[PDB]
Design a protein around this ligand. Structure first.
Ligand SMILES: CN1CCC2(CC1)CN(c1ncnc3[nH]c(Cl)c(-c4cccc(C#N)c4)c13)CCO2
Length: 290
């Protein structure tokens, strides 16, 4: 299917180092290029005859076609002996979740900078008709240069494959009510779901967990679907500026018809204020080291 797939053992090119962690699926390993010495992350997914090939096809299609400074670099994929290895950028400091578990809460300027960089990556993804659908601290990586990169298109690939598979058993739409046609064509939502998740992520970076993290997941799902659901807010109002409170208020707009787009959010005071540069992330990395 993909003409650029390498039909060889990745071990021909890389020496496999330690296990780094897991993604939505697959296992991610640190590896080193045998000729250049460049470090990479190799995500290994089992690919036996009855494994989910459509999702992996969709994930590699996203990685190959969505190249941006705020998305982890993709180097190519290997298929050998029923294992698929996806080669991506090695981001030395891991995710923001790994960082704040050592470092504690990020400052408002650091959160603003992360939000700006993630919004640039989201505006790019949405412009190519892609939706991340899994924005959280665990999926925002920080490299040694203090660059902010979105990772793990596993959820995006699974939904993309499921929606393509379903649009074969859809049948004629002429008798469908508009709200049924909406779930048939778009799954009942749009790319603005990523704006809400970024608002939640900003709270997560400020408080070390998303709102209601201690509440049973099924109860959280039930509460969100009910009428009268109030969007979350920062708990310590006095610790944060009016700009940060307004950023949370507008990214957490309950109605998707009124939630601002990534490009509109890029004009917000929080991500347009003075003093936003990689130096803020370099300070976070200094705290992580010491
Ligand atoms: C909770 N944390 C999450 C992140 C992590 C430690 C545990 C670390 N992590 C990485 N570390 C360094 N460079 C990397 N390059 C890349 Cl791409 C990753 C990476 C990070 C997150 C998801 C995926 C995927 N699909 C890949 C990555 C692998 C996953 O687990």
């Amino acid at each position: 299917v993909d003409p650029d797939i390498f039909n060889r053992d990745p071990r021909d090119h890389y020496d496999l180092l330690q296990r780094l962690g897991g993604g939505t699926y697959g296992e991610v390993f640190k590896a080193r290029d045998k000729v250049s010495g460049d470090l990479v992350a190799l995500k290994m997914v089992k690919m036996e005859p009855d494994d989910d090939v459509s999702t992996l096809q969709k994930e590699i299609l996203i990685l190959k076609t969505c190249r941006h400074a705020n998305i982890v670099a993709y180097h190519g994929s290997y298929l050998w002996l029923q294992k698929l290895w996806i080669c991506m950028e090695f981001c030395g400091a891991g995710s923001l979740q790994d960082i704040y578990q050592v470092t504690g809460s990020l400052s408002e300027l650091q959160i603003s900078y992360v939000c700006r960089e993630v919004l640039q990556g989201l505006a790019y993804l949405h412009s190519q008709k892609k939706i991340h659908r899994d924005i959280k601290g665990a999926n925002i990586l920080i490299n040694d240069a203090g660059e902010v990169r979105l990772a793990d298109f596993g959820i995006s690939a699974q939904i993309g494959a499921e929606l393509a598979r379903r649009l074969e058993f859809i049948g004629t739409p002429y008798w469908m009510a508009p709200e049924v046609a909406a779930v048939a064509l778009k799954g009942g939502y749009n790319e603005l779901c990523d704006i809400w998740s970024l608002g939640i992520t900003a709270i997560e970076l400020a408080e070390l967990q998303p709102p209601l993290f201690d509440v049973h997941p099924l109860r959280v799902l039930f509460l969100m679907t009910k009428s009268g659901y109030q969007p979350p807010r920062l708990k310590e109002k006095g610790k944060w500026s009016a700009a940060f409170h307004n950023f949370i208020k507008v990214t957490l707009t309950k109605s998707p018809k009124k939630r601002p787009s990534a490009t509109k959010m890029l004009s917000h005071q929080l991500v347009s204020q003075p003093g936003l540069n990689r130096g803020l992330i370099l300070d976070l990395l200094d705290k992580l080291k010491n």
